[PDB]
Design a protein around this ligand. Structure first.
Ligand SMILES: OC[C@H]1CNC[C@@H](O)[C@@H]1O
Ligand code: NA
Length: 437
């Protein structure tokens, strides 16, 4: 059993589900630009329509209610709120989210709002985006405006989702928007994301009409050397630094990890910033999908660490399944780092889901995925980890970034042609598991 007041939710992000990309004054985001660039998305799709949740968030609410959830993690689209990124507000964007928040509260669903889930306004990108310190400042101003208007009703806020992705996939590996490919630009982006976050936490506390519970959401990948050789151990530490400690340590008031500063060398970004980054948080969100079993790869791009596949583990449509990594990473946070309480702000999986002849979606491996990770959460809780909720990624099938509409993570199936949603078997399992609490 979980605590009686445990938060039980599902998660989405605005660009992945909303559609209506030009409606009601919305500006252009980097993902509008990126998905409309030939060859950036695997299947030729965009977020232009997606799940049409701009218009259909009522149906999404109906799903959450049918699942017996008590919370919904979703993001606010910065391009709807300040269409030019730096500039005037768009009250019609704020009013949309206001109505949505009221609909959620009316349904008994607590909103866990993400300010930034990757949809940087394009005019900011045109001035270097996360490569520019001014972007941090104006992110903080956006955070101020949203909290002034919604913070009477929404207490739980996350500044960023997965700054590692925004910086390293967006500016270093080039697979996410805006599609840059330079290490130094990636690392500069990571700094300005973190500064942005810190400036926003301060801004939000000053703007808020009541005390808030502010967090950040990080993807964390527990890393394990494939052997105990100095080479493989070092590769594990480098990957662990590249993904996890690079963000955890400055958030914790510890500066950037020195081993990584040494390794990155001249690519590393340029005390006062560090203080701001460490603005005290009320909680930390963990997004957990996979481990990294690392071998040294001296000829690879930094961090010169490659995955050693294990064919004996299960795999989904896109990842290796390793539930025990969730326990490991939570125990580490609890014992080694100062953030508390913690929320699992995402966990879930992608499969080749189809509507069967009976009308159901028989996604047994996703059911087994939830059951296995929830069992690891019970262990973590038994160890004293201060965990206060769990959000399944995703409420519904959606626009999965560079993989487009083709990679389905929902607990609900989305027919992208009709926009009809249907609960999958794993969604019914969650329903009935949550009810039994
Ligand atoms: O790839 C699965 C998910 C990982 N976390 C961020 C989400 O936007 C994404 O869909
Ligand atoms: Na498989």
């Amino acid at each position: 059993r979980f605590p009686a007041d445990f938060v039980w939710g599902a998660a989405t992000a605005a660009y992945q589900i909303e559609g209506a990309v030009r409606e009601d004054g919305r500006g252009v985001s980097i993902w509008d630009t990126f998905s409309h660039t030939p060859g950036k998305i695997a299947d030729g799709t965009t977020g232009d329509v997606a799940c049409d949740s701009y218009h259909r968030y009522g149906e999404d609410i109906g799903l959450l209610n049918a699942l017996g959830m008590n919370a919904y993690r979703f993001s606010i689209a910065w391009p709807r709120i300040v269409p030019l990124g730096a500039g005037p507000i768009n009250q019609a964007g704020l009013d949309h989210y206001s109505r949505m928040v009221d609909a959620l509260l009316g349904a008994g669903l607590q909103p866990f709002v993400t300010l930034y889930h990757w949809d940087l306004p394009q005019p900011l990108e045109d001035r270097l985006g996360w490569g520019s310190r001014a972007t941090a400042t104006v992110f903080a101003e956006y955070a101020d405006i949203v909290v002034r208007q919604l913070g009477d009703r929404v207490t739980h806020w996350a500044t960023l989702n997965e700054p590692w992705c925004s910086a390293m996939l967006g500016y270093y590996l080039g697979v996410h928007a805006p599609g840059h490919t330079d290490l130094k630009r990636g690392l500069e982006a990571s700094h300005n994301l973190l500064l942005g976050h810190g400036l926003a936490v301060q801004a939000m506390r000053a703007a808020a009409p009541q005390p808030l519970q502010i967090g950040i959401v990080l993807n964390l990948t527990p890393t394990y050397p494939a052997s105990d050789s100095p080479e493989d151990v070092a590769a594990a530490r480098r990957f662990d630094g590249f993904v996890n400690r690079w963000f955890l340590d400055p958030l914790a008031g510890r500066g950037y990890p020195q081993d990584m500063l040494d390794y990155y060398g001249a690519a590393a970004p340029q005390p006062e910033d560090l203080t701001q980054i460490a603005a005290p948080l009320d909680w930390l969100g963990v997004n957990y999908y996979e481990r990294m079993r690392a071998v040294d790869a001296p000829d690879a791009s930094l961090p010169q660490a490659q995955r050693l596949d294990d064919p004996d583990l299960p795999h989904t449509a896109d990842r290796e399944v390793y539930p025990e990594g969730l326990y490991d990473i939570l125990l580490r946070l609890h014992n080694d780092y100062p953030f508390r309480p913690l929320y699992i702000t995402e966990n879930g999986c992608a499969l080749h889901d189809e509507i069967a002849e009976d009308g159901g979606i028989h996604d047994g491996q996703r059911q087994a995925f939830f059951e296995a990770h929830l069992a690891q959460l019970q262990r973590a809780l038994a160890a004293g980890v201060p965990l206060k909720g769990y959000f399944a990624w995703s409420l519904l099938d959606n626009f999965e970034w560079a993989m487009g509409l083709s990679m389905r993570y929902g607990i609900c199936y989305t027919n992208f042609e009709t926009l009809e949603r249907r609960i999958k078997d794993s969604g019914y399992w969650l329903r009935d598991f949550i009810a039994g609490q």
